Amino acid sequence: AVAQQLRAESDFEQLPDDVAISANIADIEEKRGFTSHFVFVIEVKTKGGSKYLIYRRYRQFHALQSKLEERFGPDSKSSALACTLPTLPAKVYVGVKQEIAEMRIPALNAYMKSLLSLPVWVLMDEDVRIFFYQSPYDSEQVP
């Protein structure tokens, strides 16, 4: 199985240094108001050695997964790029928002771990790359 490892090594070598290799949740923050929602604070590490924070709420995760399913899922009429996508924790219509967010920490950690282990054509999808890059608002915060 030496051939397999050597190939795995060759393929990784070709990825740009800014590709994400891990993403783990560091905390959650409540955004108060007429209606409140929660934001996940995520620590990302890249192939090139960078480490930084991004801030994402659940509906941003759901919008990304909807795109991936249309492009690489079962009902995706593009067979060539099809693969097994991880399932995203489901929507919860009603309930205590802070408890729902806390329950999603380990579930979203598993989903991100599985996503970053997918084939190169998914890792390089422009929307997946944008989701893990620092937006201007993420980078102007002091960790």
Q: Give the binding-site size for ligand PIB (rule: CB under 6 A).
A: 9
Q: Which of 40, 58, 72, 131 touches ligand PIB by CB under 6 A? A: 58
User: Tokens standing for 14?
Assistant: 């070709």
Residue 45: name the closest of 17, 15, 22 by CA.
22
Q: Which of 70, 114, 71, 72 is nearest to 89 (CA)?
A: 114
Query: What residues between 17 and 56 interact with ligand PIB by CB under 6 A?
Result: 37-38
Question: According to the binding rule CB under 6 A, does residue 57 interact with ligand PIB?
Answer: yes
Among 25, 92, 103, 118, binds ligand PIB (CB under 6 A): 92
Please indicate if the annotation marks 57 as binding a ligand: yes
Amino acid making up residue 26: A
Q: Which residues contact 49 (CB under 8 A, 6 or more apart)?
A: 17
Residues 100-139 that bind ligand PIB (CB under 6 A): none
